C-alpha cells in the first residue's frame, strides 16, 4: 500500500515559520518527485513546487521560490516543505502528493493557522427564548461560544443525548478570536420539563463548561 | 556536482566516449557543457510533461522512467534519479543507447547547435588526456 | 502559467440526472488532464487520468473525454455521493496548475426557513456587550438576506453570519447571524429586527425583540 503521512495542525505568529512534513511508505522513494500544493479558503489549489528526495533538485514556481524550502530525509523517508515569515495570507492546507502526472497519492493535509492572537477561553452564553418557540411543540435552543483562540472548540448537548436538531455552526473570525453557536430543536415535552445543556469544550485551553439553558425571566 | 572542463573529459575519456560512433572526445564535453554546463543535478522542464535530467540532459519520455511522463519507453532502463547521481556512469552508460539510435549525437539539441563539426578539440584544450 | 477555468462555479442537480463539467485550458495540454473530487476536509481523489483513463474504485457513473483545450468529466446519474468539489489539473507544465474547481451542490424542493431571535444573556451584560442572535434554520435554495434594524434603522456594523453546508439527511442550510454591540448601546434601544428575504415569500421573515416589552 502507497502512504504519505503529514503533520498535525499548526497555529503560529506572523513572522515566525513552520516545517510541514511528509512520511512516505511503500514505493522507492528516491524515485518518484514528491510535489507540495496549497488550498486556501476561497482559491483553487496552488502548486508550490517539488522535490525529489535524495537527489539534491528541487523546483519552486516562480512565486513561491524565496518563501518555501523543500529538504527530505531518505534515512527517515520524509520530505519536508518549510515556509518562512508568515503573513495571514499563509493560512491553508498544504498536501504532498507522489508525482505521478495525475496525483494518485496524497498525504492528508496539514492546517496552518497564523495568528497573533493568543490561546483564549471561550464565555458560553445560553440563549433561551426570551418568549414564543416555547409555547409550540418544537422549540429551538442556543449556545453562544465566543472570543476564544484557537479551533476547535467541541458542542454536544445533553452529552450527546440530544443528537438529531443540532446545528453547530461554522466558526467566524471575529477580530482576531473565533465566534460559534449551536443550535438545538426539541420537543416542548423536552423542555423546560427536561434540562437541556450545551456542552463546550476547548482543548487548547482545557477548558469544559455545560450551560443548563433556561426560560428567561418574565 | 559540477564537473571542471578537463575533470570531465578525464572520465568521459576513461568510460571510452572517444571516438564513440565516430564521436570524438570533445563532441561530448561540448554538449555536457551547453546542456548541463557540467551539472550532475541540472534538471529542466518541458512542455510535454517530461524533464530532462543530469549533465547530458536525457528525458524521460524516451529514456528513463521519473513515474510521471506520458509514452515512457525507459530505452535506457534505469529511474531517471540515477542520472543525478556524481558518478557519471548512469549518464554516460545510458547516452551509449541514444547513440546507437540512427541520429547520433544529432540528439543532443545544444550539441547539434553549438559543436556541430566546428572544433569541439577546443573542450580538451590541455586536456592532458 | 497555463490557465484553466472552469464552468459552472456551482452546480445545483436533482440525484439520478445527468451533468457534464467542463475544464478549457489556456493552451494545448494535449491529453494531460486529471479530474479530481474532493469532500469536505479530505485531500483530493483522482477521478479520471490523462483525459479518459478509469482509475480502479472510480464509479463507471464518472467518465471523460476531450482533447486540446476542452475537456469534459460526465457523471451520468448523480448520486448524492458525487456531491463536493470537482478539479481539474494539467501535467503537461510546470507550475501544475488547477481549475477553480466546480461546487456540485444537491437539489431539493424549495424549503423556507424557521427563524429565531434571541436576546442577550444577563451573563453576557456582565462584559458590557450585547450579541442578538438569530437562527434561520433549514431553508432551500441558499440564497438568503439577513438584515438587522434597531428602532426602525437598519444596521450594518457588528453584523457577523455563517452559514452550514448542506444537511446530509434533507440537503438544506441554515445560517446564524449575530448582532453584537456593547451593552450601553444595547440599553439605549427598544427593538431589535430580524429581516429575512428569500426565495419562499413575496415578504421577508422578521423576528423582532423589544427590551421593554414582557
Known amino acids: 500500500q502507497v502512504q504519505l503521512q503529514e503533520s498535525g495542525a499548526e497555529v503560529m505568529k506572523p513572522g515566525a515559520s513552520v516545517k510541514i512534513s511528509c512520511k512516505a511508505t511503500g514505493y522507492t522513494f528516491s524515485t518518484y518527485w514528491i510535489e507540495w500544493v496549497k488550498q486556501r479558503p476561497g482559491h483553487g489549489l496552488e502548486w508550490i513546487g517539488e522535490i525529489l528526495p535524495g537527489s539534491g533538485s528541487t523546483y519552486y514556481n516562480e512565486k513561491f521560490k524565496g518563501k518555501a524550502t523543500f529538504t527530505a530525509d531518505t534515512s527517515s523517508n520524509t520530505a519536508y516543505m518549510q515556509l518562512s515569515s508568515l503573513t495571514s495570507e499563509d493560512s491553508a492546507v498544504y498536501y504532498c502528493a507522489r508525482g505521478d502526472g495525475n496525483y494518485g497519492y496524497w498525504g492528508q493535509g496539514t492546517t496552518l493557522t497564523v495568528s497573533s492572537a493568543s490561546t483564549t477561553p471561550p464565555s458560553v452564553f445560553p440563549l433561551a427564548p426570551g418568549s414564543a418557540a416555547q409555547t409550540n411543540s418544537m422549540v429551538t435552543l442556543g449556545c453562544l461560544v465566543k472570543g476564544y483562540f484557537p479551533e476547535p472548540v467541541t458542542v454536544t448537548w445533553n452529552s450527546g443525548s440530544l443528537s438529531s436538531g443540532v446545528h453547530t455552526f461554522p466558526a467566524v473570525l471575529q477580530s482576531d478570536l473565533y465566534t460559534l453557536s449551536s443550535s438545538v430543536t426539541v420537543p416542548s415535552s423536552p423542555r423546560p420539563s427536561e434540562t437541556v445543556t450545551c456542552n463546550v469544550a476547548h482543548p487548547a485551553s482545557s477548558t469544559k463548561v455545560d450551560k443548563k439553558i433556561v426560560p428567561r425571566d418574565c | 556536482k559540477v564537473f571542471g572542463r578537463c575533470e570531465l573529459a578525464a572520465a568521459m575519456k576513461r568510460h571510452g566516449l572517444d571516438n564513440y560512433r565516430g564521436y570524438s572526445l570533445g563532441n561530448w564535453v561540448c554538449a555536457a557543457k551547453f546542456e548541463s554546463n557540467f551539472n550532475t543535478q541540472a534538471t529542466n522542464r518541458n512542455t510535454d510533461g517530461s524533464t530532462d535530467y543530469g549533465i547530458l540532459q536525457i528525458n524521460s519520455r524516451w529514456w528513463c522512467n521519473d513515474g510521471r511522463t506520458p509514452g515512457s519507453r525507459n530505452l535506457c532502463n534505469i529511474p531517471c534519479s540515477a542520472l543525478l547521481s556524481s558518478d557519471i556512469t548512469a549518464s554516460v552508460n545510458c547516452a551509449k543507447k541514444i547513440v546507437s539510435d540512427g541520429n547520433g549525437m544529432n540528439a543532443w539539441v545544444a550539441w547539434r547547435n553549438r559543436c556541430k563539426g566546428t572544433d569541439v578539440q577546443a573542450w580538451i584544450r590541455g586536456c592532458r588526456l | ?214
Request: aromatic share 10%; net charge negative; glycine share 6%.
Open chain 3, 1 to 214: 502559467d497555463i490557465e484553466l477555468t472552469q464552468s459552472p462555479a456551482t452546480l445545483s442537480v436533482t440525484p439520478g440526472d445527468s451533468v457534464s463539467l467542463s475544464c478549457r485550458a489556456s493552451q494545448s495540454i494535449s491529453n494531460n488532464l486529471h479530474w479530481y473530487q474532493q469532500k469536505s476536509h479530505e485531500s483530493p481523489r483522482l477521478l479520471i487520468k490523462y483525459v479518459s483513463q478509469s482509475s480502479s474504485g472510480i464509479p463507471s457513473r464518472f467518465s471523460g473525454s476531450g482533447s486540446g483545450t476542452d475537456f469534459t468529466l460526465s457523471i451520468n446519474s448523480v448520486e448524492t455521493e458525487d456531491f463536493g468539489m470537482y478539479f481539474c489539473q494539467q501535467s503537461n507544465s510546470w507550475p501544475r496548475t488547477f481549475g477553480g474547481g466546480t461546487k456540485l451542490e444537491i437539489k431539493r424542493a424549495d424549503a423556507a426557513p424557521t427563524v429565531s431571535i434571541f436576546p442577550p444573556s444577563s451573563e453576557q451584560l456582565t462584559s458590557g456587550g450585547a450579541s442578538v442572535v438569530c437562527f434561520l434554520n433549514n431553508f432551500y435554495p441558499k440564497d438568503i438576506n439577513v438584515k438587522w434594524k434597531i428602532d426602525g434603522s437598519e444596521r450594518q456594523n457588528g453584523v457577523l453570519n455563517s452559514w452550514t453546508d448542506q444537511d446530509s439527511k434533507d440537503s438544506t442550510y441554515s445560517m446564524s447571524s449575530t448582532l453584537t454591540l456593547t451593552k450601553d448601546e444595547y440599553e439605549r434601544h427598544n427593538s431589535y429586527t430580524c429581516e429575512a428575504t428569500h426565495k419562499t415569500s413575496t415578504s421577508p421573515i422578521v423576528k423582532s425583540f423589544n427590551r421593554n416589552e414582557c
